[PDB]
Amino acid sequence: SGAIYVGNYRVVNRHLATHNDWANLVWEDSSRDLLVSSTTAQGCDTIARCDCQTGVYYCSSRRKHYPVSFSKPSLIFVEASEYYPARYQSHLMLAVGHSEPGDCGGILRCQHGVVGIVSTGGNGLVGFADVRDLLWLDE
Numbered sequence: 001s002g003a004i005y006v007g008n009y010r011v012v013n014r015h016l017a018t019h020n021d022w023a024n025l026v027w028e029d030s031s032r033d034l035l036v037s038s039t040t041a042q043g044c045d046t047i048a049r050c051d052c053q054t055g056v057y058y059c060s061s062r063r064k065h066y067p068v069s070f071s072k073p074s075l076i077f078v079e080a081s082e083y084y085p086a087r088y089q090s091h092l093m094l095a096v097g098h099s100e101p102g103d104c105g106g107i108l109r110c111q112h113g114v115v116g117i118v119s120t121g122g123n124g125l126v127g128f129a130d131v132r133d134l135l136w137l138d139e
């Protein structure tokens with residue numbers, strides 16, 4: 001689990017969104033595994049606006065942060081799970097590292113801020129849904 005809080009927005013994995021996230025929906029993209037809902041409290045996370053390919057992510061299944069190199073956001077084939085059939089997920093970044101389904105929502109950060117959240121894994125890889133292109137999150 002996990003979310004990003006910036007201004008009056010809450011960014012979560014679309015497959016983990018609650019009834020309240022859907023009742024206050026701002027934007028959702030199944031191909032990205034992202035959903036953004038509105039909040040009454042002001043969030044103060046900082047989103048990165050950069051093209052970094054190195055950062056640190058939180059891994060709940062190890063209670064640890066790990067430094068990783070990751071690929072730029074791209075269209076990657078993701079095996080079926082109970083939430084989606086097998087499909088291509090867009091704006092996804094991969095790194096070599098540990099990830100389990102319950103790790104989804106863990107933040108990846110670079111020196112400029114939040115880069116994205118854990119969204120895929122298995123086979124010794126960890127996949128992050130990018131948020132750096134969502135410039136409206138800051139306005």
Ligand SMILES: NC(=O)[C@H]1CCC(=O)N(Cc2ccccc2-c2cccnc2)C1
Nearest residue numbers: 033078081083099100101119120121122
């Ligand atoms: N964005 C998505 O389509 C996700 C929906 C929910 C979901 O469980 N996954 C698979 C997954 C996520 C995180 C860590 C590991 C795995 C996983 C484990 C075992 C073998 N393959 C994948 C994909």
Ligand SMILES: [Zn+2]
Nearest residue numbers: 050052110112
């Ligand atoms: Zn950066």
